[PDB]
Amino acid sequence: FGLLFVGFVAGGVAGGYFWGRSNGGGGGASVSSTQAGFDKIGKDIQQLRNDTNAAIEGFNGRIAHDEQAIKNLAKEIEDARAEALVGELGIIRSLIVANISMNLKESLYELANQITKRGGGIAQEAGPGCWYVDSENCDASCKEYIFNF
Amino acid sequence: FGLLFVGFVAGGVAGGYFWGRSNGGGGGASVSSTQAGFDKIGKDIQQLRNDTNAAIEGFNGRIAHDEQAIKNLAKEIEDARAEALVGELGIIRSLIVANISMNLKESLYELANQITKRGGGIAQEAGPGCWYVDSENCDASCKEYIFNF
Amino acid sequence: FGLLFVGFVAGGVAGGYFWGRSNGGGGGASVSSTQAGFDKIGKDIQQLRNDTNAAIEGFNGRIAHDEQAIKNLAKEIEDARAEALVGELGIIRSLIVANISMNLKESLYELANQITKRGGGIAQEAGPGCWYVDSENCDASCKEYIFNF
Amino acid sequence: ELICIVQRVNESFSLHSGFGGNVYSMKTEPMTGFTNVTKGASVINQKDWIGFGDARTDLTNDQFPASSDVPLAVAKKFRSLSGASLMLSAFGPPGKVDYLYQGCGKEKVFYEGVNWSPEAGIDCFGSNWTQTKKDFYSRIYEAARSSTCMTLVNSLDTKISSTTATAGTASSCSSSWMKSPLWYAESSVNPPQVCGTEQSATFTLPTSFGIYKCNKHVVQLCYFVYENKAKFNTFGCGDYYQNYYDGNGNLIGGMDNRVAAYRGIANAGVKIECPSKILNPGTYSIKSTPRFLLVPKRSYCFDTDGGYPIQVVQSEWSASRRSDNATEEACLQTEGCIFIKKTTPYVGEAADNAGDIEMRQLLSGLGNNDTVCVSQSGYTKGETPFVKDYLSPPKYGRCQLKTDSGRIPTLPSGLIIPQAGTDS
Amino acid sequence: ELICIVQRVNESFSLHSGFGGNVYSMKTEPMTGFTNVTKGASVINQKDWIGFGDARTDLTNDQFPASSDVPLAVAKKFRSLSGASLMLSAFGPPGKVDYLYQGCGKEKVFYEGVNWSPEAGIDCFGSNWTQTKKDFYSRIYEAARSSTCMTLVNSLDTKISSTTATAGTASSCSSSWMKSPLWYAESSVNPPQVCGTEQSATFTLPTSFGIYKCNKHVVQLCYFVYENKAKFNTFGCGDYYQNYYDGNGNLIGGMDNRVAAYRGIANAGVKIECPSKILNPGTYSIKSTPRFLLVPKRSYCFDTDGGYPIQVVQSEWSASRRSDNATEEACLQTEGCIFIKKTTPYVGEAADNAGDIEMRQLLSGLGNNDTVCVSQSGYTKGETPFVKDYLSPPKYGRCQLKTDSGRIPTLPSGLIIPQAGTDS
Amino acid sequence: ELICIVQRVNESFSLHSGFGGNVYSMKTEPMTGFTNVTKGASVINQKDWIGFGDARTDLTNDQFPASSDVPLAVAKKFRSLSGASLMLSAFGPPGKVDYLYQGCGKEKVFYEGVNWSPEAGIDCFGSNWTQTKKDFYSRIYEAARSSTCMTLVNSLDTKISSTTATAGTASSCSSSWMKSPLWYAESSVNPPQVCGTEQSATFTLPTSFGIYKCNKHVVQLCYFVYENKAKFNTFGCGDYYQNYYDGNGNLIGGMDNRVAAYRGIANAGVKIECPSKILNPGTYSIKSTPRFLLVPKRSYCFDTDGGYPIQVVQSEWSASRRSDNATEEACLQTEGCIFIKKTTPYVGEAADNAGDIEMRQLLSGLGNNDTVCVSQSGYTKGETPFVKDYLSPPKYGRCQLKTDSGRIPTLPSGLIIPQAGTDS
Ligand SMILES: *[C@@H]1O[C@H](CO)[C@@H](O[C@@H]2O[C@H](CO)[C@@H](O[C@@H]3O[C@H](CO[C@H]4O[C@H](CO[C@H]5O[C@H](CO)[C@@H](O)[C@H](O)[C@@H]5O)[C@@H](O)[C@H](O[C@H]5O[C@H](CO)[C@@H](O)[C@H](O)[C@@H]5O)[C@@H]4O)[C@@H](O)[C@H](O)[C@@H]3O)[C@H](O)[C@H]2NC(C)=O)[C@H](O)[C@H]1NC(C)=O
Ligand SMILES: *[C@@H]1O[C@H](CO)[C@@H](O[C@@H]2O[C@H](CO)[C@@H](O[C@@H]3O[C@H](CO[C@H]4O[C@H](CO[C@H]5O[C@H](CO)[C@@H](O)[C@H](O)[C@@H]5O)[C@@H](O)[C@H](O[C@H]5O[C@H](CO)[C@@H](O)[C@H](O)[C@@H]5O)[C@@H]4O)[C@@H](O)[C@H](O)[C@@H]3O)[C@H](O)[C@H]2NC(C)=O)[C@H](O)[C@H]1NC(C)=O
Ligand SMILES: *[C@@H]1O[C@H](CO)[C@@H](O[C@@H]2O[C@H](CO)[C@@H](O)[C@H](O)[C@H]2NC(C)=O)[C@H](O)[C@H]1NC(C)=O
Ligand SMILES: *[C@@H]1O[C@H](CO)[C@@H](O[C@@H]2O[C@H](CO)[C@@H](O)[C@H](O)[C@H]2NC(C)=O)[C@H](O)[C@H]1NC(C)=O
Ligand SMILES: *[C@@H]1O[C@H](CO)[C@@H](O[C@@H]2O[C@H](CO)[C@@H](O)[C@H](O)[C@H]2NC(C)=O)[C@H](O)[C@H]1NC(C)=O
Ligand SMILES: *[C@@H]1O[C@H](CO)[C@@H](O[C@@H]2O[C@H](CO)[C@@H](O)[C@H](O)[C@H]2NC(C)=O)[C@H](O)[C@H]1NC(C)=O
Ligand SMILES: *[C@@H]1O[C@H](CO)[C@@H](O[C@@H]2O[C@H](CO)[C@@H](O)[C@H](O)[C@H]2NC(C)=O)[C@H](O)[C@H]1NC(C)=O
Ligand SMILES: *[C@@H]1O[C@H](CO)[C@@H](O[C@@H]2O[C@H](CO)[C@@H](O)[C@H](O)[C@H]2NC(C)=O)[C@H](O)[C@H]1NC(C)=O
Ligand SMILES: *[C@@H]1O[C@H](CO)[C@@H](O)[C@H](O)[C@H]1NC(C)=O
């Protein structure tokens, strides 16, 4: 329902980002498209994914030094060390997912802000990723300018 | 002053979320209510609190394996191990509190967005959790629709 | 381009926070100032920096207890312990930088919200840190009131 | 008209900080807490443990289960026989049950010993069998701690040089003798004029016994203890001596009164001492005074593939009989030994000395499938990483740490308001 | 008209949680993975390691590089000579190459031993040189593990008391004798009527040898092994004995048949045994039967400044010759020793026994500049902290841990949608 | 009209990344830094430490505080007497102060030893008292390291077999003798024709002394050192010997020239050597040549309840007197011993040898209430987890780690601009 919400759809139906739209006749029925020209989002995702390499390299670069003279594997100690490292890896993961989430969200906000400042101020924000346009001042070629669909 | 701010109140006075309101006469005096029908917030809080169980279970499930043949307690080493674990527990806590904070804030934003899209666009956002309504187009039964109070 | 974006400038040119502005003649040319009276930002920064002391003190207060009877330095084990501590210090750093970032951003949002609620609703938000004012209803002394420049 | 949701907090609200967002709340709840600790014995791995016992873990006893301190499933994991003890099989005193204790298990439970206590009244010239007992079990636990398996070796290959010496017998030993050590005497020695020849022998500790690998043997290097030279000289000429040597001639045990003082208790008469030693496999030699020779005939065989700290269970009689606490003291002075002890006297269901309620509570953990830590303080499940008080060593497994309850951080609850920015 | 960007997910999307934001995606990719493990020998520090070898690491060999299992750069780090072995320099048998092995390196590679195998047919009354070999290398590895350096000590200061004893020679030893031990015999002893005088000697282990500090010496405390007293008595009177003492009179080695059984193999005749011991520097004494005296003449000197677990490389002949696996077994029973072993027979490029393709693959790591861990499973680079299977000990360096692949967490990929709040 | 706050950065701004938000700034400040390290002695727990000393820590000295290297509060924690040393109480040489050192403390400070140095000119046939000193203190430190407490045992129960032997006296020992060892001589022995009887004795190490538990005793097993058999034979018949045995006949000390070479310095005449050994409690036996017998009369009693690495303080005279560095060398070769050493000569305030400014600076930490780590590099407070250079072992407490300053991460400062999203 506009960048603060994510929705579910059954069997088929493509997932992702779409243009959705309002009333009109009183009462209308709405409508969702079949996907934008949001190539900024595609590029932003690629960039954000690649930026995770910094945190992963930090983790991979860290291997404790050890010295064992013993001849038989100490499995339980061995497994404990691994479990602890996986624990640390698990929280880093949680930080990375959140870092992606929050920066993608911001990138979506920056996408919506660009749109607001092209129909300015024909736009009128209704929370992030939503706008009220007067289908009167601005029309068919006008919305096509402002929203690209 | 509207979802970007939290305020203080003396002795009595209930804490929480309220409806507060503007000018009118020039100059007016304002006014704060005594609490909404924000049951969405009550349910959202319950859900967010319960979702912390994932991170707590992750922590509780992690106990290092050890083997001591020694007969007398090594208190200082023992206490050091505990202090380190409590340290790790302390940062997880800090992540969990922030995770609650940021998701509750978002849930409050999603509450405000629902309100904006019922008086649409009679609403006119003034930052999150705030609106400018024309006490003219829309009246007494109208605001009661839009804001439920 | 308004609190969702940060921009680059060459050789000279002061960095920081400025007032920037629109069209007019059709088409105009815009304009950026040379800095506000944003002393709220200066104070907010000072406060946020000082609040990092909590996380730093937590780290400094944590020193593992040890006991070595050995007469010659075990450099490799020694260096491994340090590398692990620096690793932990590195992630705390990353949390602190993000904590500053997110709270400064919020403080900037709270600055913009104050401005919106002085030209109310002459303001009309266009995403955070941006407004559409009708250079007609409100003029020269008016914008000076609303934006302080 | 400006209409707003307004957020506010009371004096009852407190501020909780986060990395990327703070929270006001009125209530806190602790993030986690302590894991309970149960006294008694248990195991962390039900597929790798072994028990060694007597009637109280013997499912073949006529009075089972009333004579048993463990249920059927646990008893099956024990190697036990009514009347048996490790020590009794070490020496094989006349008319005592002689069980061949053998088994494998990384976790080990020792619940026997009581069937050789002062109550049993075994004499056979023992200087102090309670001393011998404590020494014996100290060696068993020491070797068991680093071994996967254990087995009685019920007969060492031995060989005497003397063609005239004969097997020794004593009225004080049921008119026969121990299985181990064997006692050879030279009846022709008489300090008249006749001194005899120095006696000699070998005994071999094998590298294996049946399916069990031996890296280590617990054996007894016995000797006689005389009050003094004058009193020994009513039996033999010279000074008393019995020395044990490895294959090269290194002295590894014995008593030599040619260099060492006599320490026999005054007027007690001759005594036997039987200190236990851990020895490597191989062939060992003996030299002794002509009249008396003692030769080890059994051992306990151990490997060095490793094990967990062991559990030793108090093995005492009910109040009517004469007990000792030798296995307790052996366990206490041995690294990697965890001792399980009753707080109330032993009172049996079957008879006086078999089937005690407190012991069944203490051994019930043997028992469970969800024990993650075993310690001298008791055993725990894997609920949290924390316990209220320390878990005393010895200990092994996923073992909880002690922290003050105050140092356990809290989470906000009951009406929550988020906070970020400086709000000023 | 309300116009919105709308976010939606499929059944194909899954929800990934974060601390401060969740993510919907359809694909995941693992955050990290396992580091490969290469079999063979390597080092973690190219500036601090030393090799000890024979022809197969001897850059001066006439057939180099075809006779070599390592390239030129690696060979320069070895102290090697064709025909040499540590054991050969320990004893110095007649007509064998006698290399003075000496060097320093925290990491140590031992690739020799084959030049004294059963193939070499050295006799010199050896009871069992393969036994001696295994014992010798067990002591070397044990002392090398805790030392920075090693050097042959090719001549101990020695001194005999007997003014009539003379140097021993044997047809079975090329009509001469070992360099170590020296053999002194008293030709006047004849059990006629003449018994001779007890023989005596001292040997000194120095505190240093050239630039090398000695805290520890590996030496052989040899003795003769006779079948029995009767057979020894065709050579000398009494019982056989050769005992080694420290400066105070503490017995530290030898064979004394006055207290220890004879164990010579029946009808084999006299044999020599040469067990190796680790001894401190100092002056040591010897007492023996009048007719035969053995005196240590060499040692290997070690320090105790510390080292890494060592690497021992299988040293065997090609199929046509008679090998042994003594250094393998020595390595196996010694802590801190890593053994490198071929899976296919030795087939040389130069001749049969020098320049093997599999060995060159295994030793190629000696080699690299980016090895961070060396273990009994092989060596690794510092790619990730994880390996698929355990790295068997012994091991040292930045060593990876085993985790199941399933426990490695994943990151979202291929079309991503953020999620926060409850959205309800 | 579109009016905006605009954010911009210079070339002077750099980008700092965060998990959930980045920051532009022009300045950075380091998150933390190194903790200073102070040379000298200190303690981490003021309620559990003990000092042992001489005049320089003796609050009862007539010249206090000018004669003292510690203030009053620290001196009270010392057990000290002017003129005393551990070694002096070990032997009790004639006319020397004989303090009964005793105390308990997990942390231990040893600041004595100088009152027996070559300056003191004690003879009493000592082969080399500086050697004895070094050996003695090596044993003390070794036993002290694992003990909670220490006490002099100023009289062992002893017993001689000889009814004719008499107490030994020497012109070279003030015409009397040590307290320990006791010297018994047989004046009737004369190699004429008379050889005497082998001398014998027992001494007992007790299981406790007053309130102090003894698990370990440091004792001296002395013997005489002769140049050779011929020179010994002007005193007794046969070869010299004095052997120490445990209760079973195991040789644990002594000198036996029947198997061991003579090593007395040429023409030096008879000497006494007194190597210290750590022995268990019990009764011990002695056998010696008829003419001379030495019997231990004192010990130092220790427990095995554990302790921290000890601190040993350089104990030397001012330049005018003849010092040694035996306690330094003892400390250096003993695990868990931390040595405190002056860089400038000892110059006293009271007299030449008491009350030195540098030592008072070094000992001042004994001292503080906020020391968290003690190491061979000095001691630290708990400011940060980091030090610039390594803290040399031995060490204990909350001990800082070495990291390069560059690896300490930084935080943004001086005008800060947040950044999130891709801004593109
Ligand atoms: C002259 O002296 C020679 C040397 O003493 C002697 O030759 C010896 O003869 C004995 C008896 O025939 C042989 O013993 C054979 O030993 C093997 C190997 O034992 C070692 O390795 C095994 C593990 O082997 C498995 O894994 C390896 C790879 O690592 C595989 O190649 C192998 O095929 C197996 O799958 C290990 O279990 C053994 O451990 C024992 O010993 C150690 C301590 O040394 C203990 O820690 C351990 O608990 C256990 O007791 C061992 O390390 C073994 O499997 C056989 O059962 C057998 O014992 C010797 O190998 C052989 N040695 C040499 C060097 O030749 C001659 O017989 C003698 N000549 C005469 C005529 O007297
Ligand atoms: C009566 O007995 C006296 C005592 O036995 C004896 O005096 C001894 O004489 C020998 C030979 O002259 C001297 O040895 C001298 O030792 C020094 C010091 O060795 C110790 O310290 C060094 C490190 O020193 C460096 O660092 C220190 C600071 O820590 C500096 O002050 C110093 O200047 C150096 O830069 C160390 O390397 C040594 O280590 C050896 O010994 C230990 C074990 O004890 C081993 O672990 C180690 O691997 C190595 O073998 C040692 O700890 C040394 O550098 C010289 O080479 C030399 O050996 C003794 O110092 C001296 N001792 C005393 C107490 O006086 C008399 O000679 C004798 N009288 C007669 C007439 O016989
Ligand atoms: C849910 O949505 C996604 C895309 O929104 C669908 O994935 C696409 O499917 C085809 C073939 O499976 C791929 O070649 C495309 O690359 C996918 N899209 C993308 C992200 O590029 C998916 O099939 C949908 N699921 C269903 C069954 O409805
Ligand atoms: C501050 O505010 C809270 C609620 O806003 C007050 O808490 C309520 O008090 C009554 C009795 O104390 C409880 O039964 C309610 O359950 C509480 N409210 C909630 C959250 O359910 C609190 O008393 C106020 N403090 C003061 C003294 O003003
Ligand atoms: C980039 O911007 C900053 C400020 O926006 C400039 O820093 C100022 O420079 C003067 C002298 O260098 C200082 O005294 C001020 O304190 C700085 N400003 C602040 C933050 O107080 C900086 O010089 C600019 N860089 C360039 C070369 O353009
Ligand atoms: C993240 O930053 C915020 C803001 O600087 C910190 O919030 C402060 O927290 C303390 C309590 O710990 C309060 O007394 C201050 O009033 C807070 N400052 C503000 C501006 O609210 C927060 O502590 C930081 N997070 C962590 C885990 O350190
Ligand atoms: C941070 O908080 C959010 C919200 O409570 C957690 O999101 C939940 O995650 C689980 C999957 O782990 C989902 O099944 C729930 O539906 C999510 N709840 C909501 C409201 O979306 C998130 O797990 C927390 N982060 C971490 C790392 O624990
Ligand atoms: C969290 O995500 C952001 C965005 O992907 C990361 O920001 C990048 O940081 C590097 C410097 O480390 C910059 O060179 C890139 O330009 C940044 N990308 C963007 C889009 O700004 C950030 O590093 C991540 N946080 C952590 C701690 O890894
Ligand atoms: C700044 O930080 C310190 C902690 O070092 C704190 O004690 C002080 O009160 C803080 N100052 C303010 C005004 O927040």
Numbering used by the authors:
A (entry chain B), B (entry chain B), C (entry chain B): 9 to 157
D (entry chain A), E (entry chain A), F (entry chain A): 3 to 193, 197 to 429
Task: Reproduce text from the manuscript describing this model.
ICV, however, has only one major surface glycoprotein, the hemagglutinin-esterase-fusion (HEF) protein, which possesses all-in-one of receptor binding, receptor destroying and membrane fusion activities. To further evaluate the infectivity and transmissibility of IDV, we expressed and purified the ectodomain of D/OK HEF, and determined that it also uses 9-O-Acetyl-Sia as its receptor by glycan microarray. We also solved the crystal structure of D/OK HEF, both in its native state (resolution of 2.4 Å) and in complex with its receptor analogue (resolution of 3.1 Å), and the structure of the enzymatically inactive HEF (resolution of 2.4 Å) alone and in complex with two receptor analogs respectively (both resolutions of 2.2 Å). Indeed, our results show that IDV HEF is functionally and structurally similar to ICV HEF, but with some distinct characteristics.
